[PDB]
C-alpha cells in the first residue's frame, strides 16, 4: 500500500515467486493470500503471463490447505478479472484436472466448481460446468459421488431452471439409490433443498 505496485513488482516479485515454491506449506499459503491483493493493483495481462500458471500450480499441491486457499483465490480472481478471462485461462485447467486419476484432484475440481459457479454467470456455469460435473457422477469412488451431490446442492439455485430439473433431478435420483450411505444422505439432502 505505501510503496506502490510498480516498485514492489520490479523489486520483490521474483522473490515472491521463489517463495511460492517453498517446502513449508504455511509459507505457500501466506504467499497465496495476496493474489487478490496483487490482482487488484495490477493489470490482467501481466498477471496472466506471469502468475496464472503459478496459481494453477497450487491447485495440484499435496497439502489440502494450499488447494482450498488456491480455490478461494480463484473465486476472487474470477470475480475481479472478469468472466471470459477465466474461460480463456482458468477453466481449461480445471477441466484437465477433472480427468485426473487421483481422487483428491477431482475433489479440488468440485470445490473449484462450488466457488466459481456463484460468480461465473448462469450461461457459462451451465454450458461449461454441467457436462463436466454430470460425467463425474459415475466415478467408482463414493467420495466423488457424494461430493458431486453436495456440489449440485450448492450450485443449484444459481443456474437455469429447465437445465436444473432436466439434468440434476435424474442423476440425484440415481444417487439416492446408490449403495453407499453417505451418498444416499447427501443426495436426499440435495433433493430436499431443490424441492
Amino acid at each position: 500500500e505505501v510503496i506502490g505496485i510498480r516498485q514492489l513488482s520490479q523489486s520483490l516479485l521474483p522473490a515472491i515467486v521463489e517463495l511460492a515454491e517453498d517446502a513449508k506449506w504455511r509459507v505457500r499459503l501466506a504467499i497465496i493470500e495476496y493474489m487478490p491483493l496483487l490482482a487488484g493493483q495490477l493489470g490482467v495481462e501481466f498477471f496472466d503471463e506471469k502468475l496464472n500458471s503459478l496459481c494453477m500450480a497450487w491447485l495440484v499441491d499435496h497439502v489440502y490447505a494450499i488447494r482450498e486457499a488456491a480455490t478461494s483465490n480463484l473465486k476472487k480472481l474470477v470475480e475481479k478479472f472478469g468472466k471470459e478471462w477465466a474461460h480463456a485461462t482458468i477453466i481449461p485447467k480445471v477441466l484437465a484436472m477433472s480427468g485426473d486419476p487421483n481422487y483428491l484432484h477431482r475433489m479440488t475440481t468440485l470445490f473449484c466448481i462450488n466457488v466459481l459457479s456463484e460468480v461465473c454467470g448462469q450461461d457459462i456455469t451451465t454450458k461449461h460446468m454441467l457436462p463436466t460435473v454430470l460425467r463425474m457422477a459415475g466415478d467408482p469412488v463414493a467420495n466423488v459421488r457424494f461430493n458431486v451431490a453436495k456440489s449440485l446442492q450448492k450450485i443449484g439455485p444459481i443456474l437455469d431452471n429447465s437445465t436444473l430439473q432436466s439434468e440434476v433431478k435424474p442423476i440425484l435420483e440415481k444417487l439416492t439409490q446408490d449403495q453407499d450411505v453417505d451418498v444416499k444422505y447427501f443426495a436426499q439432502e440435495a433433493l430436499t433443498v431443490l424441492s
Binding site: 481449461p92 485447467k93 477441466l95 484437465a96 480427468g99
Partner: protein, 211 residues
C-alpha cells in the same frame, strides 16, 4: 539427415512439373479455400484432394502460408474412410514444410494431434514445452497409431525432439552452473529408452487387433 537428403535433387522432374503445371495460374487455390474445403458438412474429399495435389507442385518458400490450415485440419484426417492419397500428400507437404519451417511446424503439429476429447487439451505446448518433455508427442490421438503417414510424421517429431531435448538440457545445465553431468547422462539414457519402450508398445497388436 532425412530432411537434408530430402532436399537433394533426384532427377529434376519436379522442376519440369513446376514450370509446366503451375504456369496454369490455378494458384487461386488459397489457404482460406483449403480451410473451407476441409470444413464442409460432408467429407467432400474431391476438393481437398485437388487442392493438396496442386500444393505438391508449390515450392517450399510459397508453401509456408498453408502450414496453418494443413496442420490444424489434420485431426479430421483420422476419421474412417479417408483416402490414402490424401494422407500421402499431407505427408509430402509436411516433409517439405519441415525442410524449410521445422520448429514452429513441430509445435503446431503436436498442438494439433492432441486427443481432442479434452478439446484444447492444453494447447500451450510451446517449443520449450516439447523441448523439455519429448514424450508429449507420444501423447497423441490413438487413431494415429494405425495411420502410417501421420505415424511417420510423429516419428520424425519424436526423433527431432529427443535430440532437441538433449541439447536443451545440456545448455540449461551449463547456464545454471552459476555430479550433475552423470545425472544428465542418466536422464538422457532413460528418456531415449522410454521413447523406445513406448514405440515398441505401440507396435503391439491391441486386443481388438488380437480379436
Amino acid at each position: 539427415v532425412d530432411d537434408w537428403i530430402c532436399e537433394e535433387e533426384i532427377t529434376g522432374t519436379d522442376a519440369l512439373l513446376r514450370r509446366m503445371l503451375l504456369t496454369n495460374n490455378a494458384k487461386n487455390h488459397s489457404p482460406k479455400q483449403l480451410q473451407e474445403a476441409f470444413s464442409a458438412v460432408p467429407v467432400n474429399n474431391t476438393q481437398v484432394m485437388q487442392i493438396i495435389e496442386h500444393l505438391t507442385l508449390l515450392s517450399a518458400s510459397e508453401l509456408i502460408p498453408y502450414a496453418e490450415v494443413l496442420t490444424s485440419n489434420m485431426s479430421q484426417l483420422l476419421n474412417s474412410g479417408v483416402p490414402r492419397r490424401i494422407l500421402q500428400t499431407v505427408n509430402k507437404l509436411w516433409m517439405v514444410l519441415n525442410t524449410v519451417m521445422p520448429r514452429r511446424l513441430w509445435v503446431m503439429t503436436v498442438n494439433a494431434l492432441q486427443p481432442s476429447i479434452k478439446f484444447v487439451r492444453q494447447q500451450k505446448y510451446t517449443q520449450n514445452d516439447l523441448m523439455i518433455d519429448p514424450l508429449i508427442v507420444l501423447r497423441c490421438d490413438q487413431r494415429v497409431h494405425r495411420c502410417p503417414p501421420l505415424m511417420d510424421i510423429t516419428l520424425h517429431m519424436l526423433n527431432g525432439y529427443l535430440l532437441a531435448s538433449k541439447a536443451y538440457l545440456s545448455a540449461h545445465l551449463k547456464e545454471t552452473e552459476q555430479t550433475r553431468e552423470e545425472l544428465k547422462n542418466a536422464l538422457l539414457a532413460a528418456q531415449d529408452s522410454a521413447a523406445v519402450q513406448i514405440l515398441l508398445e505401440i507396435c503391439l497388436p491391441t486386443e481388438e487387433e488380437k480379436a
